[PDB]
Amino acid sequence: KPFTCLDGTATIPFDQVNDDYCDCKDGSDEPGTAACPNGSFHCTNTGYKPLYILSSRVNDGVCDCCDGTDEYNSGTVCENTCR
Amino acid sequence: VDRSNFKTCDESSFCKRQRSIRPGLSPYRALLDTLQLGPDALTVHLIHEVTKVLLVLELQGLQKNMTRIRIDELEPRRPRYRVPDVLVADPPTARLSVSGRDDNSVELTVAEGPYKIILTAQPFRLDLLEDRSLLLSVNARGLMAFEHQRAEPGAWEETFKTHSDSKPYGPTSVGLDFSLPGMEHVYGIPEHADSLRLKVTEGGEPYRLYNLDVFQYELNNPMALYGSVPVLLAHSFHRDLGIFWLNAAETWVDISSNPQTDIRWMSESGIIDVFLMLGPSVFDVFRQYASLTGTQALPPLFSLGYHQSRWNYRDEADVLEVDQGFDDHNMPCDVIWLDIEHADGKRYFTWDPTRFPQPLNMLEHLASKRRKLVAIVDPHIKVDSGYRVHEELRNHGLYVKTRDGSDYEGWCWPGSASYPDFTNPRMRAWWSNMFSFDNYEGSAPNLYVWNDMNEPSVFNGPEVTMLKDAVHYGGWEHRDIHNIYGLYVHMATADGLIQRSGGIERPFVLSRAFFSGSQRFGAVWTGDNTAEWDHLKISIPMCLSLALVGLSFCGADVGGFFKNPEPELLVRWYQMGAYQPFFRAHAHLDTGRREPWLLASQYQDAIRDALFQRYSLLPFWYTLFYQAHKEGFPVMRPLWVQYPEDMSTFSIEDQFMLGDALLIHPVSDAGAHGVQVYLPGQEEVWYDIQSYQKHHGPQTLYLPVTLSSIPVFQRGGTIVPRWMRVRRSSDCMKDDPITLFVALSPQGTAQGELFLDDGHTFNYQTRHEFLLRRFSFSGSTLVSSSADPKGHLETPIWIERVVIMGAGKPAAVVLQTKGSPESRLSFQHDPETSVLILRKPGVSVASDWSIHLR
Ligand SMILES: *[C@@H]1O[C@H](CO)[C@@H](O[C@@H]2O[C@H](CO)[C@@H](O[C@@H]3O[C@H](CO)[C@@H](O)[C@H](O[C@H]4O[C@H](CO)[C@@H](O)[C@H](O)[C@@H]4O)[C@@H]3O)[C@H](O)[C@H]2NC(C)=O)[C@H](O)[C@H]1NC(C)=O
Ligand SMILES: OC[C@H]1O[C@H](O[C@@H]2C=CO[C@H](CO)[C@H]2O)C[C@@H](O)[C@@H]1O
Ligand SMILES: OC[C@H]1OC=C[C@@H](O)[C@@H]1O
Numbered sequence A: 001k002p003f004t005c006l007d008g009t010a011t012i013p014f015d016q017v018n019d020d021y022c023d024c025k026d027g028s029d030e031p032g033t034a035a036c037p038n039g040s041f042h043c044t045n046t047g048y049k050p051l052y053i054l055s056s057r058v059n060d061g062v063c064d065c066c067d068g069t070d071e072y073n074s075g076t077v078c079e080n081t082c083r
Numbered sequence B: 001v002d003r004s005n006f007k008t009c010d011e012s013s014f015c016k017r018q019r020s021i022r023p024g025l026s027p028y029r030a031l032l033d034t035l036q037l038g039p040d041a042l043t044v045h046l047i048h049e050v051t052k053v054l055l056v057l058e059l060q061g062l063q064k065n066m067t068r069i070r071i072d073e074l075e076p077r078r079p080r081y082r083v084p085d086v087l088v089a090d091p092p093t094a095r096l097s098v099s100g101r102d103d104n105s106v107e108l109t110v111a112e113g114p115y116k117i118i119l120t121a122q123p124f125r126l127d128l129l130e131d132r133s134l135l136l137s138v139n140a141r142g143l144m145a146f147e148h149q150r151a152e153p154g155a156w157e158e159t160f161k162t163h164s165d166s167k168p169y170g171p172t173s174v175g176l177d178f179s180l181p182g183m184e185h186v187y188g189i190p191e192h193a194d195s196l197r198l199k200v201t202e203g204g205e206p207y208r209l210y211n212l213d214v215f216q217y218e219l220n221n222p223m224a225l226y227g228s229v230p231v232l233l234a235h236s237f238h239r240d241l242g243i244f245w246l247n248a249a250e251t252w253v254d255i256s257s258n259p260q261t262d263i264r265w266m267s268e269s270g271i272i273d274v275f276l277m278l279g280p281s282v283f284d285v286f287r288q289y290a291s292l293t294g295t296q297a298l299p300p301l302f303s304l305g306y307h308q309s310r311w312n313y314r315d316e317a318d319v320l321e322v323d324q325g326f327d328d329h330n331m332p333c334d335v336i337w338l339d340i341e342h343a344d345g346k347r348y349f350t351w352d353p354t355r356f357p358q359p360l361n362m363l364e365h366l367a368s369k370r371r372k373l374v375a376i377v378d379p380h381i382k383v384d385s386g387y388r389v390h391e392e393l394r395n396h397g398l399y400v401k402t403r404d405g406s407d408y409e410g411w412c413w414p415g416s417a418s419y420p421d422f423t424n425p426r427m428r429a430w431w432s433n434m435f436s437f438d439n440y441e442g443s444a445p446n447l448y449v450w451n452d453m454n455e456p457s458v459f460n461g462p463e464v465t466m467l468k469d470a471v472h473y474g475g476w477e478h479r480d481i482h483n484i485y486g487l488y489v490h491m492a493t494a495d496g497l498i499q500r501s502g503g504i505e506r507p508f509v510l511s512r513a514f515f516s517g518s519q520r521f522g523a524v525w526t527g528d529n530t531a532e533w534d535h536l537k538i539s540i541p542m543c544l545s546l547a548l549v550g551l552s553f554c555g556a557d558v559g560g561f562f563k564n565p566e567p568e569l570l571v572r573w574y575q576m577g578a579y580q581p582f583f584r585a586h587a588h589l590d591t592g593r594r595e596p597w598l599l600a601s602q603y604q605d606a607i608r609d610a611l612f613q614r615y616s617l618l619p620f621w622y623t624l625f626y627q628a629h630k631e632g633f634p635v636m637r638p639l640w641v642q643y644p645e646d647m648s649t650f651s652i653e654d655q656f657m658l659g660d661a662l663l664i665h666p667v668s669d670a671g672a673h674g675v676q677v678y679l680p681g682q683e684e685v686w687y688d689i690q691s692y693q694k695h696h697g698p699q700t701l702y703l704p705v706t707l708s709s710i711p712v713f714q715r716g717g718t719i720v721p722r723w724m725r726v727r728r729s730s731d732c733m734k735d736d737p738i739t740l741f742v743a744l745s746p747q748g749t750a751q752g753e754l755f756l757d758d759g760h761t762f763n764y765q766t767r768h769e770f771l772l773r774r775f776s777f778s779g780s781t782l783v784s785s786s787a788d789p790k791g792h793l794e795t796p797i798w799i800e801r802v803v804i805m806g807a808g809k810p811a812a813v814v815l816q817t818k819g820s821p822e823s824r825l826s827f828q829h830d831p832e833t834s835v836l837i838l839r840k841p842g843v844s845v846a847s848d849w850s851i852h853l854r
């Protein structure tokens, strides 16, 4: 079955989910990339409090999550600082 | 402003002497028996009929439609100053041939024509023509005046208020007039807080060019401000012309009308050295002037982002809180600035040990956020035996001296201070070397520089500057070199930033004072403006006057320096500043804090919108600056530059263009609910970039506006590149995908370029590591091709989207690129606006590709 935007604005195949192009008005098809202007990235921060950051902070070369998972293909290698 | 602190023409003895000469028969005549003609120049002696003083005219035809005129004494008591380091090369000449000659006239042909010069012997005159069209006359009103060096109130010793100029060489001023038949509009000669189209000076003061620190300067007047560029442009429906008066001394410019405009230049000292730039187009004049003084230095990308400053951020914790504030309020910012309070009691190159104890750690934190810092470094050095900089400059004799040979001491921010002689090439080398990371302790590669007070500002000096009779390198007086002092500070600082990196990193230096050639060293700004609506308005004509004379990297303090702007004014200032080349918020010591998140939500939101527009347009700004760097064309342009035959555009200063693609009319009145936008061009179309509504030119459109409105229109026939993923700073964005905004002309065509490189080194020039792409749309196909095949670049940048305005709905969209099978793209189309969005082309920006609609 296809993916439906959390806002009900479109239905797209799951191949357009995290494909680094924004397809949903709410940004819900790109939770793992920097593609949507109003998306969010979830910092799982295993063992500590989870946090959400702006999608524009995914692979921006700046360490935003204490687990460093927001920087996965930028060249900045973030260390785990969750404590 | 306190006008009594600054000389009017009647208070400057040389101006009063020159200006007292009224139109008439010139006493100068050319002695044609002394005429000598060589392949590079024509020389002839001139004589003053009363005094019998002999001068030498060196007349030269030059390549690229220019003429140079130099006049000096035949046998001077001492050599006269000739401006060094402004010209980038010895201009290539064109041969003058005698095509006609009688007892009172010589007609010269430049190369194989069509330009000609007529030299009239008595009275001395020069006429410049293209075939039978007279372009300009020299000495037509007989106002040439060359005060020879002698062995009359104020001709010798002269006092202004409490300051005595000993004037050892007496009256030595030079002046000459130029006539521009068919010209009614003239521009340039910055810096003045005045209209873009220059006013006639007949019944008032001439325009003054003398770099001065004018506290609380006022608007719509000809008082000299911080910089001086002695270049005047003249525009008509039929032609463009330029006059470049290469003189570094105090200069006054008189403008008068008759259709014809006459211009008179009057300088304190030096020779007469003038370049006549004959166009014929305004772009030809820009190329001509760029061939003489060079082009705008290519800014590092970060310097085209947003700069946050004030006098002063208190300490490291304040800087770090400001940094964190931008991120907590989702507002981008590339640089945070440190004014004079960061230093140890205004000893430059030092840090206050309580406020900034660990500058490298502060710079490391900003580097982790991919941000930079700018530190102020002024050219006045505290007189303090415990200050190494002072001790070294004193010990090496590198300070400006008084006539008695002692180091000049004046008053400035650190109290008693001395002034390094930046005209001395060894002083400039010492200064550049002081920027090494070993010498400037606490500096790092993300620290750049601001040169202020480099007129030089001297608090206890005449007109708040240095004594006329102070002595510089080679024995020249301060009066001879004044207007290039600031340029030298700017130059030496830029070279310091280049050298500390081993010649790899492009500099970023902001300077207050400037001259012809200052474009080669960085940015300038309009100084200490005020938080008032008419100062917001005047930022356009002031930066346009600078753009016309090669200084493209211009701006005005966002919010105004003096006083507290009301939130509505601060919003409108961010919007204006967001569309001006140098974009910095700055504020005076006594003002309330005005970081943009301190305002109510409605104002924050409008400011964030403006910041996002600027950051998304960085690829476009970068490309315009590359075109300025390569061609010498202005980034910010008056409408008459793009519409030279539209006489209704000749005086417009409440609107401007960025390149040939965007027309901007910022809101500049409190409580405005609409703006009158003039959209020029017969058979041209304009797209409102927010609504996508198409408007046909020529028309005046009354556009409704709200607090968040920035009236911007894209010209049909252009392609604008954007980074739609706005991040916290430009470094974060510089490897991101591009969205192309294609605005179709009525013929269904469009074109545009895109420059890309690493964002900060000279590798584009030393290694040809860059991309220059051409995007072209015609006949239902969009094509990417190389605009410069020498440029290659390793980059992950790709095309994520194409937005086409003025397009119908296609049945299919196909992409072809070498190395890939044919691709089908999905698309969305709005039939109301005729906007077509092409989804994820997915192709590298370094590759040739084509997209076909239907
Ligand atoms: C140095 O100076 C020379 C001499 O001025 C200069 O060359 C000239 O350039 C102009 C363009 O600026 C040429 O003018 C054109 O002439 C052609 C006919 O040959 C016309 O088709 C052109 O018309 C266009 O523009 C008109 C409005 O101005 C429109 O009505 C029309 O529809 C067209 O769009 C235009 O008149 C001129 O022919 C040459 N002259 C010579 C002798 O070469 C040269 O470019 C300058 N060089 C530098 C380096 O500055
Ligand atoms: O470094 C502080 C401040 O310096 C300059 O402005 C001065 C302020 C008041 O008076 C004198 C005028 O005599 C000015 O030079 C420029 C500012 O941008 C800067 O913040
Ligand atoms: O199936 C279409 C595409 O969707 C996502 C990723 C690619 O692997 C596929 O080609």
Ligand SMILES: [Ca+2]
Binding pocket: A016, A017, A018, A019, A020, A021, A022, A023, A029, A030
């Ligand atoms: Ca997607």
Ligand SMILES: [Ca+2]
Binding pocket: A057, A058, A059, A060, A061, A062, A063, A064, A065, A070, A071
């Ligand atoms: Ca990040």
